[PDB]
Amino acid sequence: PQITLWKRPLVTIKIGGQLKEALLDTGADDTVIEEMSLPGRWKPKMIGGIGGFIKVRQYDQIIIEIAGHKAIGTVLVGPTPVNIIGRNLLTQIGATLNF
């Protein structure tokens, strides 16, 4: 698709068999999802946003569908105002910004 930006670019994702809403966020290096259960081991990561740096859980090689496109990559889990799909997965679905 071609998504204009008059409204938030919210899409449906599927992770762990569950549908969730997420924001397609070119200003995010990383994908961050609200508290949920994911399989496997995690590692620590500090990420910095508008209000400062926080701790999140990094899960690698997680299967996630984004607006119907399959991705397999790193998902960070922690407190966020909205689930955000960052560039690590936007590149896997072939997204670009155009003007």
Place this chain on the structure above:
Amino acid sequence: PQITLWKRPLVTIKIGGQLKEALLDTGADDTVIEEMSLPGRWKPKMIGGIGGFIKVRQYDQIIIEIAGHKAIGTVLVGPTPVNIIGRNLLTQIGATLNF
């Protein structure tokens, strides 16, 4: 142009007579620039993200040249760690996300 997302989508902007680097950010409702003076009236605002909230000054009707494309709108000024071009100005330059 078509901007890929392998790297942060940074562009040059001109605002208040000054050249700055800023992130094209589809996950940002609003445009947020590091501390600088702008002319005209302003009012305080709180905006929030990962890490929490920051206080900013809201200036309306500010012209900003973004990668060579002029656009006018509200600009928030405050202690952001990165200059952010949000959707309020991305729409005006015709930016879309494509995949």
